[PDB]
Amino acid sequence: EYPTVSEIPVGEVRLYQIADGVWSHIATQSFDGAVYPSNGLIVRDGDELLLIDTAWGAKNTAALLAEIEKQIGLPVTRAVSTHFHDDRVGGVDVLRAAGVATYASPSTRRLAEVEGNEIPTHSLEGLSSSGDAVRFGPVELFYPGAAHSTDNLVVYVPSASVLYGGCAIYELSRTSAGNVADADLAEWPTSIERIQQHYPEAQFVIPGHGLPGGLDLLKHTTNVVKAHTNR
Ligand SMILES: C[C@H](CS)C(=O)Nc1cccc(-c2nn[nH]n2)c1
Ligand SMILES: [Zn+2]
Ligand SMILES: [Zn+2]
Numbered sequence: 441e442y443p444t445v446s447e448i449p450v451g452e453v454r455l456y457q458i459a460d461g462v463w464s465h466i467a468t469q470s471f472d473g474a475v476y477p478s479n480g481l482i483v484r485d486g487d488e489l490l491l492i493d494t495a496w497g498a499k500n501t502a503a504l505l506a507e508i509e510k511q512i513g514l515p516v517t518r519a520v521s522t523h524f525h526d527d528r529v530g531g532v533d534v535l536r537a538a539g540v541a542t543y544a545s546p547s548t549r550r551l552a553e554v555e556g557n558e559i560p561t562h563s564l565e566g567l568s569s570s571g572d573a574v575r576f577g578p579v580e581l582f583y584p585g586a587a588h589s590t591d592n593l594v595v596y597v598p599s600a601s602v603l604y605g606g607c608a609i610y611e612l613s614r615t616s617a618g619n620v621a622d623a624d625l626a627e628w629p630t631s632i633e634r635i636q637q638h639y640p641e642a643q644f645v646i647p648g649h650g651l652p653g654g655l656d657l658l659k660h661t662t663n664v665v666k667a668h669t670n671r
Pocket of ligand 3: 525527607648649
């Protein structure tokens with residue numbers, strides 16, 4: 441079964457096989473007095489692994505690398521962070537120290553700088569305007585426009601029809617807004633339709649926090665954002 445928050449002590453990471461050569465990584469971390477689960481992606485890139493997002497902190501991210509080595513045994517050589525928050529860049533310094541080349545859009549890297557979070561080393565060019573998409577090894581990176589954050593990217597794995605929505609996408613059982621401190625509640629439903637229009641063939645949809653689902657997560661997320669807009 442997909443691991444839930446009460447099953448993962450903070451400091452431990454679980455790996456979950458989604459398809460051949462595609463895994464999600466699941467960690468847990470405290471935020472303002474409660475502990476939450478968090479998802480990331482791992483994609484086989486030939487003889488190497490491409491990591492999508494840290495495990496939300498340095499200690500969790502070290503546990504992630506240890507779990508990858510134990511269970512998969514290929515090197516993580518590249519990583520992309522999908523937004524500037526700590527569940528996506530927190531641990532980038534651990535990755536860099538372990539030899540991982542770290543990437544994020546230029547908007548993400550500057551927003552990370554400002555918030556005092558860790559900063560990916562390399563900039564992803566070609567994602568500066570909503571609707572833009574670029575190839576990055578075995579994945580496509582898509583900028584859907586502002587949503588959970590103004591700099592949020594989603595990640596598509598064509599080999600497997602896996603759509604990684606990151607924190608722009610809510611899981612089914614979440615019916616209220618999470619951290620919207622940095623969100624653009626007006627644009628958000630528009631960006632979701634863009635995702636829907638760019639990846640209608642998506643088979644698995646992974647939110648930034650919680651249980652994977654289908655393209656139904658897109659509709660559901662839009663409802664939650666709008667419910668919260670006239671609450
Ligand atoms: C740092 C990380 C960036 S998305 C984060 O805020 N995760 C996160 C995840 C799930 C819920 C909440 C939340 N906030 N208020 N009620 N629930 C926050
Ligand atoms: Zn976030
Ligand atoms: Zn998040």
